[PDB]
Amino acid sequence: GRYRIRVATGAWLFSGSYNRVQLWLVGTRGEAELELQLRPARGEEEEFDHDVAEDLGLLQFVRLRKHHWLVDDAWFCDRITVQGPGACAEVAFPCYRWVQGEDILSLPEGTARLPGDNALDMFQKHREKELKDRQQIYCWATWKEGLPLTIAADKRLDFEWTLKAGALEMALKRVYTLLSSWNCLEDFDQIFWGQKSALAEKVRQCWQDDELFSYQFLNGANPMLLRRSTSLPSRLVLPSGMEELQAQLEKELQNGSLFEADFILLDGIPANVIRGEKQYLAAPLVMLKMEPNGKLQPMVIQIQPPSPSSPTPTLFLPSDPPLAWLLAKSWVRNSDFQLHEIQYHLLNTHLVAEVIAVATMRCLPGLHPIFKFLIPHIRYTMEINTRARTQLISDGGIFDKAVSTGGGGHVQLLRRAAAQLTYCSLCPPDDLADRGLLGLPGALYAHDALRLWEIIARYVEGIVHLFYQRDDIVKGDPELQAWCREITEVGLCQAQDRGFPVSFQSQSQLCHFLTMCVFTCTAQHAAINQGQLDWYAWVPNAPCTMRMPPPTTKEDVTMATVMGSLPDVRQACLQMAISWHLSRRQPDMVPLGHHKEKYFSGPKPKAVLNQFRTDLEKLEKEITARNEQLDWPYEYLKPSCIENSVTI
Amino acid sequence: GRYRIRVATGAWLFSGSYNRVQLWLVGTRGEAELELQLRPARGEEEEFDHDVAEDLGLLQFVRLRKHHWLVDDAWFCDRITVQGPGACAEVAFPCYRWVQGEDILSLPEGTARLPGDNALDMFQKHREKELKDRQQIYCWATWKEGLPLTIAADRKDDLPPNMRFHEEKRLDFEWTLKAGALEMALKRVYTLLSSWNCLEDFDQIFWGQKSALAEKVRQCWQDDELFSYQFLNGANPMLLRRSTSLPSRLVLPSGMEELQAQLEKELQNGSLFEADFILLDGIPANVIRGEKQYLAAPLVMLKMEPNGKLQPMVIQIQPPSPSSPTPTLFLPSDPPLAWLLAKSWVRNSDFQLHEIQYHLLNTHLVAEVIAVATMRCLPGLHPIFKFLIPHIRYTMEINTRARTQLISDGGIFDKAVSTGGGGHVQLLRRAAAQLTYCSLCPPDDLADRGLLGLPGALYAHDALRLWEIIARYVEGIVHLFYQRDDIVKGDPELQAWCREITEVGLCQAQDRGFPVSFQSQSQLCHFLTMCVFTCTAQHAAINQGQLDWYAWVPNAPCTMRMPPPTTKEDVTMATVMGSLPDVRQACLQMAISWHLSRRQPDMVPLGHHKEKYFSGPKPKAVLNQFRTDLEKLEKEITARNEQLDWPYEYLKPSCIENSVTI
């Protein structure tokens, strides 16, 4: 028989000209040792023809052993397609990994399989051995107690914070030295350098108007906090002489047009000590009304919650001294930065995707269809999360030197956010319905996220119904239930009380969970991550820290109070530096659904992926056609802008 | 005997509101003592009337003293115009100078006068004592040995006060320094955490230009057509010459006979062009922050296509050596990164020979020599001084600022550029050896380089048009004040000025074609056309292209941090990025390019100096003609540039600075 082996190689660090790899073509009945002289080249899927004597039959495995290689040499094998005798289709053998060590690497058949009761099966023994190895090379590690577990620590964020921190402090000190005329609001202009978008310049022009401030809770960088008020909040205590606000609040409550954004998760979080001076934090509540034209308007801001020391806090109105109102809006924006960069971007998207990634690597073998479905969406997640825990959110890290929740309070905020990290909150048809953002016309994030949920759910159902045709197939899959408990009981630290499933009992439960996983890894991260390029490039639109306590009297708020509460040159330039470094477009960006890795080998999972791409193209056309009529477009959930995994 | 005195004031810093000037209306038959009270206004000139009793006759001088002024009060008098009692015209007395001290300042009548043999003439005695004072105020200095001499000023405050910046220029310079410093500090902060591993990382510091052509350079810098277009119409169009023969350093190894055939075919066609950077051979490279920079002396061969565009043929980054007899010849059909690195090395060397030879030496140092020699040997009455004083303004201060900040020891050039740290001085000495009078005259230089008649050579076309317009201007003024050639020979101040430029200022440049004397009207006309073109048009051509072509750092790097490549297959992106400057050197190159090439808000266009040194109707009609011809050339260049994808805008006469000011 004539076997045609096409080797697709991702990357290679071959020191020599040619390297020899032994390639056993393991089939049902017999195997065939072949020697391959690897001469890779970019975009060259090296073909090798071989004439065998024995009949291997249907191929099942491909075994690779790097015969007498160099120590430094490395080879990332993408896939091995073997065309057997006759016109038989090119059987694919997904590798997509660094072939490392002198041990024999076994690549099974690319058709995805579920485990069975036959322990003497070749794919069953292979997936058991692969799971035993991948539970050894992927280990859970607790970073902080009460937080979800991480991967064990044993180019877009690749630096050293200890080496760069002193030079960054000297650079910020020289900016402080050559620029010390800071008294007015426009003085953030001379540090406003970079690739500012049209939306970023529109934020610069129009951040002070109340409708942009209200627009940020719906379609800003953090659209995850605004909920429709079913009742007035218990922390909203109105003092005497403010019965007109009470009448307006009850009128907007009865009309269903009352909305709230409560930052109560930040109450009691100890603030950072940045360069000696103690920063300050608050837990505001902004009450907003939905005007009949479709635009939110702010009703009231309560910067601090009630306390035993202050039973009724100051309620700042949009019809107050304009600088007190500006400072109240800035405090809300600072707290939106705090709850955005910790709860909704770091916890709800990064740490959840890292838990999904580690559990997918640990409990789903390479043959499993859910692994092949999820491995494009978990790429570089543990790497970026480890770099974040090493540099961004470490002790004395980036957050300890830039952000007011840093220095220890961000860990407490992560604990409090993981306390309320619910499975309802990670699903937009559940989160937006719980928050009452369904049917809202101006809620462009909610509309795009619901449309993405429909498309991603179509993708998930299309993949799942090929391999799980009945509910008892979902129940009887032990690797799937192990992956489910590894997410819920182990990775998310017993999150079954937070709505996460302990086991899968139906097709639809698994479909909802996998839709949540793909939405968290791709769409929710895009919606929570693309906002810092334009909304957070202007430091007064979202301060990273506040250097003064929140105001208690409106008439004492001057420009000196606003400018003293707003960050100085070092904190603001550091915040813009981080926001510019994190939200820049990397050249290796893979859009959603457009991964070039062919893990599945059947034509029907590929057809499901093509329908996913077609629906995403239709959604991108719809969002683009919607956005021309809007002066404030929502481009954060365009599928071309949605990255295929949490990589930043 | 009613005399009308209009005192036009250029500038003033008055601590009080009571400043008095004693004035003397010195005529042929006597003088009149008058007292004026200066109340200057912006955009207006002061009006006075005085009745005299003695018939002063024809007015010749106006003498000024500041009667009991404060120490900090300063007055910059523009001119004083006196109208007599009869129906005679107004008589101009140009000052355009800071009136300082308790001494009497004498301003002669504005008609330009040649020196004469009458030693008892009042104007002759005045110009003699004026030259004696100016030769003590304007002194030569040897900044470095082997270079053209500079004004004697260790710092900018040691300069003569008339050569200082005015308030708008100085304030703009300080604002430019702080704006560049803030932009560099912001770039340092914002790209300190960023990675530096690909050419798109140079995008991270390129935002904020607002220069359209620089964005086009960003789009098309890897194009070989743009790389070859820069030799004709880029920031440095002064090096490319047509090859009359193959260069001797162009050593082709075995097996490369096709390139030999192409070079010989383009040589026999006459379309072979060369840009040789051999003046940089052996120049010691900088060591910036302990990191060794690297230099090279490339040679790039070019061919004119029949469409009119240059295309590159071969780059030899290093010249042949006893250790390396045949260096690597880089071709457009090479591993792309090796050819990109070779083009980057050529553009580094173009930056080196542009910012040192053709900008610092050929324009700034030559205009400084012209300025210092004009202020040493030409008095205020001399027509050539009145001709040349608008074209030498702010040159001494910008050169002193360069010698204290930019090209000083440990200066900005020693912190950004590969020739810094001492090698730029050796490069300057070598370039001053090649600083010929032919190279400063665009008819002679563009005939010598063989760039005449090229339709795509827009610098050459605009430079010849500007040369003939400026030469018409020079011819009008000179033929007004020199009817015959013996009058040119018989002018001792003119010959002294010629010797001060050639023998003294340019350090005995008679061997480089510079005249030691003027023997004809047309020799003086050619020399003055060279002086005006060097001060105004050549500096605009060599200077205004720094932000359009130098803002994108890979288009023209200031330095190289890796040795030039010897093998083409080993050139990776890591080699290109490690060779190209890091973010601090690149940001400093961007800052200096924007600082030097931006349009000054106080820019005087060429020919549009408002100072009225000449009093006669005829020199002013000549200046009018000059401005009319310049606006005709402006219309021609604009109509040409409207049909060009890559327009040449540096020689528009509205954009040409009237002197070397930046």
Ligand SMILES: [Fe+2]
């Ligand atoms: Fe992220």
Ligand SMILES: [Fe+2]
């Ligand atoms: Fe210049």
